[PDB]
Write a protein that binds this ligand. Structure first.
Ligand SMILES: Nc1ncnc2c1ncn2[C@@H]1O[C@H](COP(=O)(O)OP(=O)(O)OP(=O)(O)O)[C@@H](O)[C@H]1O
Ligand SMILES: [Mn+2]
Ligand SMILES: [Mn+2]
Ligand SMILES: [Zn+2]
Ligand SMILES: [Zn+2]
Ligand SMILES: [Zn+2]
Lengths: 32, 263, 56, 84, 43, 56, 126, 65
RNA sequence: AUCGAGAGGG
DNA sequence: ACGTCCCTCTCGA
């Protein structure tokens, strides 16, 4: 059952950016 | 022979070397000085842009083009856009240029000075060419494009003197020295224990001589003989950048007389 | 601004570039310098006040 | 209710503040298109126009120095000194 | 008129008509240089 | 302490202040752009009228 | 360069030295008002004294436009009752990029990015 | 942010000699201050122009479109 | 626009 | 009980 949602910090656990490499981060338009 | 006599030291593609014997410092300076910024040359001035997907801004690249050296050999045959008669510019006052580049290469793809192209009437005068000193001959790296970046801009190239902007800088660095053994005492030194063995003899002290310490100072010691070395990017050859140094000066003094005898 | 010497009047001298420019030797009484310091400027809307600012 | 000159006591010289209000005052008036008395030797400016007036004590003005108790000694610009 | 991103569609879409990279799927959308030429000084 | 014993004032200025060896003690190098927006009431007097009509 | 100031070689910054490169950014949103009574972006006919004509009819201005003074960027309108968003009084640049999309609510959302370069002018900190 | 055309200090054409500097230190594998010195730069003003340049343009290109 | 909180400039 | 003067930005009901 539902509650709400939680601001997440980047490069953390439950963020995609944790998952990326130089190549990936780029097409994610995110900074290496 | 004449007056201010001279003797080359070396000569080359980009540099020239000479002692101006029997020349007045106020002259060799004022000459030096006009050589820097007061000799005319050409260089891109306006630039309109149709398509620029590059990473560098429009006016980013803008500023970059203005600094590309242009051929200027015969240049007095072009007359200052501002002082000519055509609603803005023409072929009498300006060379026009254009640059198409598209990122077809799947690698990383370069645009150069070579890649420029002239799309106006030359009227048979050596103008507007972007010098290449390059070994590879490939010019000057202006920009970089990933397979799909485009660049369409065109460049109106007018005549300017560095006094207005560096780009119309015919010159570069200008070497200047005189009186190597400070025989005229024109500069108090700076030493901890010995002045001498700490300030190194410049690479010119061998064309003048040591001073025979025992002897005194001569108070009639005057400034004469100057060690100079001039260098041009190439927009103009190096003989013309020294001689149209002299030339410009004459014209400068000249128009004194000219407006002298008007009043 | 905690004293008279730091609110003196001047003659104008309209010039270029965006910066107020003042004589090196009136630094001190303002304790001002040339590394980031702004400065104020006013202008009397009359005559008597100008006199008040000129003769005082 | 006033002082008579015969018994005046205050500074007989003119004060930085008297003057600079006086030069000021007339100068405002003059530039308000007022009758000037000294003869222009060619002065667009009214601070100077007044200042010449000042140096000919041709200024029809009385300072009215007030005292702490209330009463005032009048003093003609014709009669005040000017040194400073 | 309006562009995209992850893919960069040459889209276009006058007023009132929603917004999405319908060819891809990310409401980012830019707006392209008017063919109006502009000019900058080489200084 | 804010709207009487002190307020703000029309006709006021501001900028970076630099310093000038070629200037006089008693004058201040104000830029144009302040001088174009910094006015000053002046009356119409025969001694200047031939001036004001060239500024207008 | 007296009293902690720095006289700087103009010709050398003429070659591009200490040349900045600035960017502001403006935002706005079509702000509903309940009964699906929505805002929008337009070119209108109480309105404000800018010079809209740099717009395209869609409520905008597009890259490459050299904008100045207080020239409208965004022409939002609300139930006519003008709501556009002009340039910044102080500044004078050249449009760079702009982005449209929808909020968490799903209404239009426009952020405009205008560039400009800055130049070592007498009186700039270092 | 790419190589700038010539030198801030005396303005000498140095835009060109960039790509030629790379292989000198790489392809030929040599000393930095020997690669610049053997591209015709004895004024440490020009020398400072190359040696202290970061070519962030490359990180740029690497982006999606 | 208004009040409230926040970082810098002398 | 008030608690140095002024100034430039940026952001949430
Ligand atoms: N907190 C402050 N309150 C009041 N005035 C200040 C304050 N900080 C700076 N100032 C004013 O700024 C001037 C000096 O500050 P500043 O830091 O510029 O001095 P400085 O000596 O240049 O710095 P540096 O000390 O690094 O050389 C003075 O006129 C001073 O009154
Ligand atoms: Mn300081
Ligand atoms: Mn300071
Ligand atoms: Zn012409
Ligand atoms: Zn898409
Ligand atoms: Zn150099």
């Amino acid at each position: 059952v539902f509650i709400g949602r939680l601001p997440i910090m980047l490069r953390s656990k439950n963020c995609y950016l944790s998952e990326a490499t130089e190549s990936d981060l780029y097409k994610l338009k995110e900074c290496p | 022979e004449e007056g201010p006599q001279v003797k080359i030291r070396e000569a080359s593609k980009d540099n020239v070397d000479f002692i101006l014997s029997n020349v007045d410092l106020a002259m060799a300076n004022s000459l030096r000085r006009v050589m820097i910024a007061e000799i005319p040359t050409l260089a891109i001035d306006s630039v309109e842009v149709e398509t620029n997907t590059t990473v560098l801004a429009d006016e980013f690249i803008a500023h970059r083009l203005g600094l590309i050296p242009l051929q200027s050999m015969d240049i007095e045959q072009l007359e200052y856009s501002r002082d000519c008669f055509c609603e803005d510019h023409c072929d009498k006052c300006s060379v026009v240029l254009t640059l198409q580049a598209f990122g077809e290469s799947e690698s990383t793809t370069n645009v150069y000075s070579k890649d420029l192209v002239i799309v106006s009437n030359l009227m048979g005068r050596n103008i507007g060419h972007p010098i290449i000193q390059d070994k590879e001959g490939n010019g000057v790296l202006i920009c970089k494009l990933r397979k799909g970046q485009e660049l369409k801009l065109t460049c109106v190239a007018k005549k300017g003197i560095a006094k207005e902007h560096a780009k119309w800088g015919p010159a570069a660095a200008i070497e200047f020295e005189y009186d190597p053994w400070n025989k005229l005492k024109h500069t108090d030194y700076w030493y901890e224990q010995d002045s001498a063995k700490e300030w190194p003899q410049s690479k010119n002290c061998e064309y003048e001589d040591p001073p025979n310490e025992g002897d005194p100072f001569d108070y009639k010691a005057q400034a004469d003989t100057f060690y100079m070395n001039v260098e041009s990017v190439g927009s103009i050859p190096v003989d013309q950048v020294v001689v149209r140094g002299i030339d410009t000066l004459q014209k400068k003094v000249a128009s004194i007389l000219l407006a002298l005898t008007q009043m | 601004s905690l004293h008279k010497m730091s609110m003196m009047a001047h003659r104008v001298k309209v010039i270029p570039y965006s910066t107020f420019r003042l004589n090196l030797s009136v630094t001190s009484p303002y304790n001002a310098d040339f590394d980031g310091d702004e400065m104020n400027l006013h202008v009397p809307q009359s005559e008597e006040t100008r006199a008040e600012l000129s003769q005082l | 209710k006033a002082i008579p000159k015969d018994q005046r006591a205050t500074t007989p010289y003119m004060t930085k503040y008297e003057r600079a209000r006086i030069l000021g005052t007339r100068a405002l008036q003059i530039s308000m298109n007022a009758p000037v008395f000294v003869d222009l030797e060619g002065e667009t400016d009214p601070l100077r126009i007044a200042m010449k007036e000042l140096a000919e004590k041709k200024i029809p003005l009385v300072i009215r120095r007030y005292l702490p108790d209330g009463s005032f000694e009048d003093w003609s610009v014709e009669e005040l000194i000017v040194d400073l | 008129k309006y562009i995209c991103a992850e893919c960069s569609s040459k889209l276009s879409l006058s007023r009132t008509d929603a917004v999405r990279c319908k060819d891809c799927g990310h409401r980012i959308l830019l707006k392209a240089r008017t063919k109006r030429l502009v000019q900058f000084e080489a200084r | 302490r804010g709207n009487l014993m002190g307020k703000r004032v029309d006709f006021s200025a501001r900028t970076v202040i630099s310093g000038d060896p070629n200037l006089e003690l008693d004058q201040v190098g104000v830029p144009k752009s302040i001088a174009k927006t910094l006015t000053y009431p002046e009356v119409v007097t025969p001694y200047n009228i031939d001036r004001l009509t060239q500024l207008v | 360069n007296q009293e902690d100031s720095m006289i700087m070689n103009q010709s050398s910054i003429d070659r591009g030295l200490f040349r900045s490169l600035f960017f502001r950014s403006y935002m706005d949103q079509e702000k509903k008002y309940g009964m699906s009574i929505t805002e929008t972006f337009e070119k209108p006919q109480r309105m404000k004294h800018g010079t809209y004509d740099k717009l395209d009819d869609d409520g905008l201005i597009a890259p490459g436009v050299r904008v100045s003074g207080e020239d409208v960027i965004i022409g939002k309108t609300t139930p006519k009752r003008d709501a556009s968003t002009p340039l910044r009084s102080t500044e004078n640049g050249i449009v760079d990029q702009v982005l449209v999309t929808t909020n968490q609510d799903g209404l239009k959302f426009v952020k405009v990015r205008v560039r400009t370069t800055k130049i070592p002018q007498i009186g700039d900190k270092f | 942010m790419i190589v700038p055309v010539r030198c801030f200090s005396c303005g000498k054409v140095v835009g060109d000699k960039w790509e030629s500097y790379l292989n000198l230190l790489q392809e030929d594998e040599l000393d930095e201050g020997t690669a610049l010195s053997r591209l015709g730069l004895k004024r440490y003003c020009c020398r400072r122009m190359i040696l202290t340049h970061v070519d962030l343009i490359e990180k740029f290109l690497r982006y999606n479109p």
